[PDB]
Structures are given as C-alpha cells and as structure tokens.
C-alpha cells in the first residue's frame, strides 16, 4: 500500500552528522532497492543515492545510504548550508506494482540569527469602502525563523473571523515574508476606534494600529 514513512524534519548544526530514516514494508523496501532524492520544492529533484548505497558522480562523499529489512536511511556526514532541502526516499512495491515515494523530510541547518519582523499595516481604501467592502492588510517582512503568530484586535478585543493569513515564504534574502488580511464590512470598520495587527515572533510581540481617521 501507498506510502513510505519519513520524519517530517531533521536538523542539526553545521558539521554535525544528520541522518534521515525511511520506514517501509516487506513488499517495497523489504523486497526492492531504495533511492534517495534531494529536492527544492516544486523544482526538479535530483538523484542522490541509487540502489540502497550507490552514489552518482557529482554527489559529495558525505552522503551515504544504508538499508536493512524494511528500513533504510540517508546519512549526511557533516551538515553544510547547501544541505537545507527536502529529501525523499523511494522504492518499487512488488505487490502493488507501483513506484512509491517517501512522505519526505525537510532539513534545517541550525543556528542562523533570529531576525525580528517588519510590520506594515494598511486600513481599507476609500474606493473599496464605496464598493461596500473592507480589507485591512498586515504585511510582515524580513523575519527569521519563519514562524509567526498574527492576531487582529479591535479596540480592546480580539477579532473573530474574516482573517486570511499566508504561510511564511522564504525570500532570496534567506528571511521570510507573510501577509494577513482582515475582511470586514465598512460598518464594522467604522464602528470601532482602532484596529490592530499584532505579530508574535520568538517571544517578541509587535503591534501596529490604524483608525478610520482619514483627516479626523
């Protein structure tokens, strides 16, 4: 049946040994050889290890493979910055007649300085208020690591619903970005004195505040 199991993440500091496991059944890993692939998401993978323990030419010596029974592993012997990617194991299942991927593992090269976010808040446009809608936009840049918690508050109070928040996405920067959108009615908007976007990142909370006060 359908899936090899990998741990969703593996981490370590640069130079450490980091290994990734891949747990299967009798019918796939127990029966057949295992390949490992290295992939940046949505982009073409690259073969790293074939036939349990072989390496293609061009692949660094610090990558090794191992198999036994219905389990296999990849070893990264001296974690380097380049090694921050996804990794998949794979094998042919003789009962199902199918080629089965592992659920995959993300590696992170531990450390890297924490970077506080930049919070930029926009109130609803006039022109959108005329259209009888209202969107508040909270834009959150240049943070590391990529884990934030966005809350919306109106006057002294947590905003219920109408919040869409993106999952943070790495920039070429090596820092992250994220948006959050609050949808309201122009009446909700206008029935409070103040709206806040509050972003909590690694125990630190930044707040920005806007008010229907266009020229008031």
């Amino acid at each position: 049946q359908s899936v090899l199991t990998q741990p969703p993440s593996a981490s370590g500091t640069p130079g450490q040994r980091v290994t990734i496991s891949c747990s299967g059944t009798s019918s796939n890993i127990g029966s057949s050889t295992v390949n490992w692939y290295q992939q940046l998401p949505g982009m073409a993978p690259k073969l790293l290890i074939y036939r349990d323990a072989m390496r293609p030419s061009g692949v660094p010596d610090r990558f090794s493979g191992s198999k036994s029974g219905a389990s296999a592993s990849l070893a990264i012997g001296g974690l380097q910055s380049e090694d921050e990617t996804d990794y998949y194991c794979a094998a042919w299942d003789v009962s199902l007649n199918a080629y089965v991927f592992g659920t995959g593992t993300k590696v992170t090269v531990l450390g890297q300085p924490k970077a506080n976010p930049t919070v930029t808040l926009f109130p609803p446009s006039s022109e959108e208020l005329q259209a009888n809608k209202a969107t508040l936009v909270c834009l959150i840049s240049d943070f590391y690591p990529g884990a934030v918690t966005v809350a919306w508050k109106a006057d002294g109070s947590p905003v219920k619903a109408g919040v869409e928040t993106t999952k943070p996405s790495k920039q070429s920067n090596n820092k992250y970005a994220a948006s959050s959108y609050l949808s309201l009615t122009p009446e909700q908007w206008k029935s409070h004195r103040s709206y806040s976007c509050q972003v909590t990142h690694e125990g630190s909370t930044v707040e920005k505040t806007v008010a229907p006060t266009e020229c008031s």
Binding site: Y50, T103, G104, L139, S179, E214
Partner: protein, 229 residues
Amino acid sequence: EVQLVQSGGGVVQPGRSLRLSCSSSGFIFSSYAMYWVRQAPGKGLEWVAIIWDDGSDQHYADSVKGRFTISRNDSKNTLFLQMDSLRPEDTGVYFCARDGGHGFCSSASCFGPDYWGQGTPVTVSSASTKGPSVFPLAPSSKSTSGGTAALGCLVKDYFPQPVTVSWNSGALTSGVHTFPAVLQSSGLYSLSSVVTVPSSSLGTQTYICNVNHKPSNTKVDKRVEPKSC
C-alpha cells in the same frame, strides 16, 4: 546529456481534459522505461505512472487509474500523459523522468527515476477566470521612526495566478516588495505590492502601480496618492 522537457500544462475546471508531453534527447529513448510524477503545492512527490521501453505494459497510481493514459512514441522520442475527467486533487507540477535500468521494473529489479524534467504545472479548480479588483494602499500621514513611508496596491480576488505588478511603468524598482499571494477560501487570490519610499518624496513625486492579469486580459493602473490630510 539527457534532457527531458515537459509541455502541455494548464488551468482547467473539474471534469475537463489535458494532454502532457515530454520530449527527450541525449539518449536512446526506446531503451528505457519512463515515468510521470507529480507534486501538489505544499506536498510531497507522488508517482503517477510508468511505461515499459516498448510500451508493452503500463502501470498507474490507484488515484488515477482509468482517468489517465500513459503512452509513448519511440519514433519521435516523446512521452504522453492523457488526463481525462480531471479533479481538483490533481493539481500539481508534473514531471517526467527516465528509469535508469533495463526498460522495466519487477520483483527482480527496479532502478528508479534517474534523470528528471523541469515540470509542467496543472491547476484544476472550480473557480473561473476572474480579473482583479485594484485598490490603492495610500501612504499614511502617521510618521514612522526612520526615513520610511510605505505605499502599495491591493490586487484583490483574481484567478488564476499569476499577476504582474510593476511601478511607474517599471521605471521604479527601488524598494518595491510584492508579496506572495493569499489563496482565499473563495478559490480566488489576493496579493499586495508595497514600495517603501523616503517620506520626503511623498507628495513631491507620483506613484502608480501597473497591474496586468494576462489570463483575463485585465490591465489596470492605479494612482497611489496621499490622503487629503
């Protein structure tokens, strides 16, 4: 050098069809088994199909069996994927790959994918093509510590991706930041594109965002102006 180039991908609604093709070079195509593998946004690799060297047999993922057909043309060194009665869960990037072994996979042996193509994206959605609504995100009179003023545009409820935003007809590239779009519960997208400018300029200069949504052919220029305050 083995090259694999995928083609055919698109945006469709549920029940409709596509056909993908994978053109190859740099190897004796008819010797190897060929794959199709897909990747749904945010998710892992999922094998779709395999076809033997001589096309004498073909195997499919359970999820796709009967809707998809893999076939090949060893005369033209091309691999096809006929995708019928497409479902929103079929959205992904589609890769072809070469099998590195001896034309097939069995209880005896299976090399697995050795070389891969670049991918061709497939989007199956209940949404239809919608041009965006474009709102200016006016620069606030409320000062900030520093030489910063932020202004932007809100490119709201479009389908599909992508959209192109530039500033002052692309004559402005300095301190533009266009964020990754949100995929709302609607099935529609929204993005924001900001320019952080030195607050001295704000009012000395004019900022217009140029928004181009090719799929709809919706082209909109919004002037972004300080509020009357």
